[PDB]
Amino acid sequence: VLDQFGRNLTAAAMEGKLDPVIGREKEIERVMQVLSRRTKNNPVLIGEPGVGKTAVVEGLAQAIVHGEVPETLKDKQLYTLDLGSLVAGSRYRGDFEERLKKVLKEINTRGDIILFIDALHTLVGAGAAEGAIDAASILKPKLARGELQTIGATTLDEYRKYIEKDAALERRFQPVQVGEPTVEHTIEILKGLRDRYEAHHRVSITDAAMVAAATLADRYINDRFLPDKAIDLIDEAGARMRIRRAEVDDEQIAEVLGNWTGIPVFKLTEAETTRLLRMEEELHKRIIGQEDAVKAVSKAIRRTRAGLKDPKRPSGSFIFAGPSGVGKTELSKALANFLFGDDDALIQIDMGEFHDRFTASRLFGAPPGYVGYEEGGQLTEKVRRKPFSVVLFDAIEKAHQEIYNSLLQVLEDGRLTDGQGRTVDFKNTVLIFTSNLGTSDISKPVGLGFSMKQKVNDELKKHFRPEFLNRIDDIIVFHQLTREEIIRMVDLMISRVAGQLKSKDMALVLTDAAKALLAKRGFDPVLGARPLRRTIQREIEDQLSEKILFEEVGPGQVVTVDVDNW
Template identity: 80%
Template sequence: GLREIDERIADVRREKEAAIDAQDFEKAAGLRDKERKLGEERSAKEKQWRSGDLEEIAEVGEEQIAEVLGAWTGIPVFKLTEEESSRLLRMEDELHKRIIGQDEAVKAVSRAIRRTRAGLKDPKRPSGSFIFAGPSGVGKTELSKALAAFLFGDEDSLIQIDMGEFHDRFTASRLFGAPPGYVGYEEGGQLTEKVRRKPFSVVLFDEIEKAHKEIYNTLLQVLEDGRLTDGQGRVVDFKNTVIIFTSNLGTQDISKAVGMGFTGSNETDSVAQYDRMKNKVNDELKKHFRPEFLNRIDEIVVFHQLTRDQIVQMVELLIDRVAKALAAKDMGIELTDKAKALLAQRGFDPVLGARPLRRTIQREIEDTMSEKILFGELGAGEIVTVDVDGWDGESKDTDGATFTFTPRPKPLPEGTFSEMSPEAAEAVRDVEADTIAADVPDVPEITDDLFTEGLDEGPAGAGSSQPQR
């Protein structure tokens, strides 16, 4: 059927691209012709199908059914087709692909989710409920996003609500829906309407301490019964949601005790500092929230202050994303240890944590490289090494430090081509570029004469002739 032809076309296309990468242009030309014939076959098949001339009856498999059900119900496809237990057993590893450090937080969340999935908790309550406490910019929101992607397939399954917008009792109607006769009745609540439309989701209440205390009473019903009645009288089911509250309570003075926002210089200082912060956070939570609210929370997770090494790891994670974007332009990027350290130094703020790091990389690396690419100073086929001038790598004073960008040619594939002279290698690159750009039907044959001519040449300036192109 059409699906089989589509799969064959995809396979041939991958083989063709691999042949081009391997400089095997004769094979690439043959695969191009094969791809063209398969495309014609598909068009004819589709025409027959639309006219009703096909004798065969299409079969619907498990994957297609799961895909349709997923679109109808909002249940992630992997929950229908994959053994969930195998995913849960590797949950920590999956979350740590996005979360640097915070081992205790990741373990606590993973344990709670596994308990729920194993059926060892009240089925009426939400799948999980957590308080993420700690300083700003240490990964509370990022862990929520990673959890949404892991449990429900993508970050769009995260419902994020800024509780600073609900600081008085009259704003509760915006959250849960206005009663009949009031403005906004037909619109539904910001929380209830989103959960009603997407019942499989992570609900993040950001900075919960800023909300009015009357709102906590309504949220108690969600935590206890897993349901809530909106302003229109509809019962909204929260049993398949994960509820997360973030809070900065007890951490306001943390940045004053740690120079430049990093934790103590040795492990003992770091542990002692974390214990003090954890005790203070728990004390502040008990003062601010009623016991019945805290008792309905599965886990209270206090996040660690970030260390210098963890900030550097975050730099590497963000630079990997830049590298993927550059790969589409046939370019690469490498950072020296000094460049990573400088980005970590400039991208961390004692109050905001690691939040400015992304903007720092955009300003210092991406913006500069964009200009150099547009001016033609950097281009395809190059790897750019980013280093630092005017800084010793340790000093807190980085005002005189500047980033440098040094391009070098990407290495040729291993084998025959890596052993050529520069002149012969350049000739091969030109042939490849011409072939790809023009999609030439008759691919020029690269003969041994070309390689011999390049290899036999003497040093530059010795009267050797350039290979014919």
């Protein structure tokens, strides 16, 4: 291969340009085991993007120049081969085939070339298609005879879509699994890469930072992979140190990770133990009133996270029973923003539309050949995208029996089988079920007799199966809100729009007489404290638009509104 489409990794390892490859030695030995074969000496590094597939080959190219190769791979000039640059420039017939036969002629003359084709899935249909002169069919004769040594690097998905699907190419290539490193393996990688990133940034990097880079990237980043994600934290923190300047620490990694996810450095640089020690006071910030509920779930999460925890249970299962919209999904959002630092972790499934077991095949995915195969079965993109999550099952009493027979897995194990065959882990997810099985007192202070908390408890036993209810951690019951409890919610929500008023130098001069009437109008004992915000926008914000209807802007108008008494 010329130095036109690739790069001599063997000559890069002579000049000490390749990064040290710590670990992955079972894989470098496996690649040598494939390359030492007589025929079809062609390994494929199958992994994920960033697990160190190129690093295995960089570690192999170091093992060639250090003489650690078994007199079949000695003095093999290992070249990469960018097939993307090799396709690039083919707008005419025969351009790609000419640039590939020049490479293939160069390997024939020298006889000591090992190709490394990153993205070997590109080989299929690189020229035109499968049955056509592509890069696959050009290389297939010499790959089948061991006369072209080629290290591939696909992912597991791309190996199955392109190499296993292509008949007469799955045989030419030998799968070498490069798994994602563990966190303790990644710390050993970072400590081996310590001298490279200390010398580049001229910034000392401590052992506290490299443990923090591997641990927090596995937790907070779940679209990328360990080796890379954690190196990128070490690399970006050393780079942002250069734009501040001598030492990268635990807190410096949490800052450059907080700029990616949006978690405040504090929620990254914390300590589960303290992290959940002042849990109650931070969950009061968006739940005022119904305080025994907050202290119950704050106690339950601190039991089922801190200290002992089996890995065969979720972080907490909850039944939120009681009156609707009094803080039911408002607490679960407040728990999700406490969970690891992101409010965007709450998922409403809205089980009220389900009154069918056939629609459970439209919730957990369809059997293939049926409708509901793409949307439905979307739990892959949600909960194994985010192992730290909160799933809310609103109105579970509306659903069919067969729907939560499939939910008996996730309370026992913490795993779920998708309709497309995925392991959708509910392992760290706080699952929360929800039923307004209580509406009797709710429906006026009368009942079925001739004349609270335990009325809705035995309605769960009446409606559901006891097999489902007892795996659930704690059942939380909400009560009717006192008028002193409602006006604090009015106080919290009138202050939300008040910040948008002084942006325009307007001021809603607050009075408590209007706040009592908002509590009367924005609450009923069937639905209340959910339509309180529409009561705010219909009764306050309609009449504050009458200011600019009669054109009141000025430097600022101190408006005070009070509607009549009821």
